[PDB]
């Protein structure tokens, strides 16, 4: 059994309503437990565990460390967000819809899309289905694309049309894929 | 805790096992880039993000500080080793499975701690070395990690695939089977 | 270029 000691540092930036609410949380973790952190709302280092207390007092006493950290909200978060607005926040990936039976089951495969925000509805001859429809949690592919599988318990008969309505921020008009029995 | 967009500038990791280290920048749970500490160069995951130039010296200096911080915490905690957690392995396809059409197999390994894991692909018992790519150790809210492994495919009915995951938290190597059906 | 948050050294070591 090999023994291992892990140390982590996370310079976390939080953004709400664009630039209206900006928060910085600098976390120091050892191993899975956070020992000391710096929050932008308090403007000073505060220990989470007893192990973080000698570090917190050492950094709060030093003027140079405290100065840089209190300015990091505009230097790291607010500056990097301006770079994100024309890069990652501008990224729009068109979703691909596919209907395949599984027939008592019918699954609507919405794959390869960005950002994460998505709303997918099931229809049976212009009437929306809510009771017999199960959705998988928003699956993260990791390569800056998402996928979501939405199944529907259906009892088909002649003349029935099953429409999968999909809404995404990258689309002006929703994509609708139909299936006939 | 609650925000529209959550970013990490950046995820700093250092462990005494290798001694291996990792430096990444995350945005909404997606890896923007990783700094190759050996080759001393920034490797971006998105082509649009390559217009910016991140200095690799930033990561190397942060690792040197994380090396100093890890040794100081081992002495303070009286050599408190990291608890080995049981990882969750799940295998799925990037797009709907079509025999003869190119697809990508994804092996999601969640709740990894300590971040030491060997992920290898196997086809009908034979180990696969061609068409494999892995993402960096992506951080989690509970300060644990998750890694994603990719495999370029051309699905066939007779061709079976398995994802071999080697972790200390597991009693035996976990193999998650995938059938094209 | 993205500006990162810098970790500071731990006393004692």
């Amino acid at each position, epitope marked *: 059994s090999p023994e291992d000691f892990v140390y982590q540092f996370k310079g976390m930036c939080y953004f709400t309503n664009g630039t209206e609410r900006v928060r910085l949380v600098s976390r120091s973790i050892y191993n899975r437990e956070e020992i000391v952190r710096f929050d932008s709302d308090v403007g000073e280092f505060r220990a989470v565990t007893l192990l973080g207390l000698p570090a917190a007092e050492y950094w709060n006493s030093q003027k140079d460390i405290l100065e840089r950290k209190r300015a990091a909200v505009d230097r790291v978060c607010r500056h990097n967000y301006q770079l994100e607005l024309r890069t990652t926040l501008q990224r729009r990936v068109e979703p691909t819809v596919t209907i395949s039976p599984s027939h008592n089951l019918l699954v609507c495969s919405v794959t390869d899309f960005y950002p994460a925000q998505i709303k997918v509805r099931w229809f049976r001859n212009d009437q929306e289905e809510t009771a017999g429809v199960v959705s998988t949690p928003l699956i993260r592919n990791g390569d800056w694309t998402f996928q979501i599988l939405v199944m529907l318990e259906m009892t088909p008969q002649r003349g029935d049309v099953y429409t999968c309505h999909v809404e995404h921020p990258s689309l002006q008009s929703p994509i609708t894929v139909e299936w006939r029995a | 805790i609650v925000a529209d967009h959550v970013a990490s500038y950046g995820v700093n990791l250092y462990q005494s096992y290798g001694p291996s280290g990792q430096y990444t920048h995350e945005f909404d749970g997606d890896e923007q880039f990783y700094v190759d500490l050996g080759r001393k160069e920034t490797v971006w995951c998105l082509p649009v993000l390559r217009q910016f130039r991140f200095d690799p*010296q930033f990561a190397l200096t942060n690792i040197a500080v994380l090396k100093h911080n890890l040794n100081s915490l081992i002495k303070r905690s009286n050599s408190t080793a990291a608890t080995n957690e049981v990882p969750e392995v799940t295998v799925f396809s990037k797009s709907p499975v079509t025999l003869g059409q190119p697809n990508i197999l994804i092996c999601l390994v969640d709740n990894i701690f300590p971040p030491v894991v060997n992920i290898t692909w196997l086809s009908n018992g034979h180990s696969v070395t061609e068409g494999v790519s892995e993402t960096s150790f992506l951080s989690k809210s509970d300060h644990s990690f998750f890694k994603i492994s990719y495999l370029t495919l051309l699905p066939s009915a007779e061709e079976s695939y398995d994802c071999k995951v080697e972790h200390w938290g597991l009693d035996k190597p976990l193999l998650k089977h995938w059938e094209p059906e | 270029a993205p500006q990162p948050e810098l970790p500071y050294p731990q006393p004692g070591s």
Partner: T-cell receptor
């Protein structure tokens, strides 16, 4: 980003010394640092700022709203203040002290 | 206050010199600079703890620096030449990209 400042400035002793600095190509994550050097002696740190005005025991720094300009104020200028003043932009990858031409301020007795 | 020893050094060409620098208490980053009369600050090498991330800046293979401590750093110049004559300044900060405070310097003169 780079800084441009006058080569030399003559100021009377006792009067406040205002040293200008131009940095129009500056970014939001960059600081406005000020250093001085008496002949060939070791460079001395004075003050630094990011957004607004800063006040130190040694001098005062006034950064404009547009951040395209900055001014260093030495309230009681003495003969000991006769040095070459460097206005440097520090931010991002910047880890090396790069001195420009500077302003050499000669306080006049 | 950053300390530097010796204050001045007069040597012959081909001789080896050892320049010492003691930084401020708590400062983990050390910086080595070179300065000539009527010219700007020339970067040589810098340390972060005990390791040197940027080896570039050194004029030749003759120039070397060590910080085994890793607190006090020594800059060695073997087989000194007339062109190596300059004021060697040492700077320190709590860690990299932080406010640098300089020492008194070391005036070096190499003669034929």
């Amino acid at each position: 980003m780079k800084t441009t400042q006058p080569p030399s400035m003559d100021c009377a002793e006792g009067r406040a010394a205002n040293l200008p600095c131009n940095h129009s190509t500056i970014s939001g994550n960059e600081y406005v640092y000020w250093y001085r050097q008496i002949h060939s002696q070791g460079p001395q740190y004075i003050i630094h700022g990011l957004k607004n005005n800063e006040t130190n025991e040694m001098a005062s720094l006034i950064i404009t709203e547009d951040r395209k300009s900055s001014t260093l104020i030495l309230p009681h200028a003495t003969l000991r203040d006769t040095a070459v003043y460097y206005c440097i932009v520090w931010g991002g990858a910047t880890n090396k002290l790069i001195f420009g031409t500077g302003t050499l301020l000669a306080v006049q007795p | 206050g950053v300390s530097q020893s010796p204050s001045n050094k007069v040597t012959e060409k081909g001789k080896d010199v050892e320049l010492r620098c003691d930084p401020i208490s708590g400062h983990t980053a050390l910086y080595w600079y070179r300065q000539s009369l009527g010219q700007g600050l020339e970067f040589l090498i810098y340390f972060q703890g005990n390791s040197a991330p940027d080896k570039s800046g050194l004029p030749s293979d003759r120039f070397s620096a060590e910080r085994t401590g890793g607190s006090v750093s020594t800059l060695t110049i073997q087989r000194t030449q007339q062109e190596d004559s300059a004021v060697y300044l040492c700077a320190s900060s709590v860690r990299s990209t932080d406010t640098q405070y300089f020492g008194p310097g070391t005036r070096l003169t190499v003669l034929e």
